[PDB]
Amino acid sequence: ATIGRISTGSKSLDKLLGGGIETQAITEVFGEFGSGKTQLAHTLAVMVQLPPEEGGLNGSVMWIDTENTFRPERIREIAQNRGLDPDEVLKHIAYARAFNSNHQMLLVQQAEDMIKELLNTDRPVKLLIVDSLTSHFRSEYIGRGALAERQQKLAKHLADLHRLANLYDIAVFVTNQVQAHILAHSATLRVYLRKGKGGKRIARLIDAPHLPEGEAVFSITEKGIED
């Protein structure tokens, strides 16, 4: 099936991504605390709900939160400032907090149930967010022997997410806090975010040889993100 794209709200970042984030893929954003990962997640959760000629997919959202960082009022602000009803936008986001990494893995299985229900409705699930993908794995799997065990469990979690993306035509968007590399990763596309000067955020594609090699620049605003 043909893939869909979701505009991020920034034309610069959209060009870096070839039009937006893709369905049938996992896009991982990574960078230090404060680099804009969660604001990009909030913006995408609104953008995907727009019609396709405005860069959305007329889609619903599912959001797994490991750090209590989802903010419904920020959704409402972004929606209002993009011409959308804030409470309708919120109603098409299903939200769950993952208590630990094993609960996080179970929540991906639960998510399939709602995905199936909405699949042939006018707003099927088109975006599944995991913010943060790695935080519980990093606190639970630590010390001698933990590198191999943690990487194996992560890879299985990511395989479950790839299955949902590919089987149900969903964009999976995940965040990863990284304090300034040797570990393997299995996301489809990895985007490094960082702070720039003048309040700007800078994005670069990592290990993607046949895609754009420049950098996108964006700001965080009342519309979420924009150039």
Q: Is 36 within any annotated ligand binding site? A: yes
Rounded distance, CA 135 to CA 151, Å?
13
Quote the least distance from Cβ 91 to ligand O0E, whole Å.
Answer: 7
Rounded distance, CA 195 to CA 220, Å?
11
Side-chain half-sphere CA neighbours of 12 within 13 A: 14
Residue type, 223: K
Restricted to residues 103-142, the positions that interact with ligand O0E (CB under 6 A) are: 107, 110-111
Kindly state the number of chain residues that form the binding site for ligand O0E, as judged by CB under 6 A.
12
**SS3 call for 141:** coil
Check binding of 172 to ligand O0E (CB under 6 A). Answer: no
> If you write DSSP's letter for every residue of 143-157 in order, what string do you get?
STTHHHHHHHHHHHH
Check binding of 86 to ligand O0E (CB under 6 A). Answer: no
Looking at residue 76, the DSSP 8-state letter turns out to be H
Q: Is 66 within any annotated ligand binding site? A: no
Quote the least distance from Cβ 151 to ligand O0E, whole Å.
Answer: 23
Q: Is 139 within any annotated ligand binding site? A: no
Check binding of 64 to ligand O0E (CB under 6 A). Answer: yes
- Among positions 25, 58, 90, 135, the unique one binding ligand O0E when judged by CB under 6 A: 90
Contact 126, 24 (CB under 8 A): no
Check binding of 174 to ligand O0E (CB under 6 A). Answer: no
The binding site for ligand O0E (CB under 6 A) comprises 62-64, 72, 90, 93-96, 107, 110-111
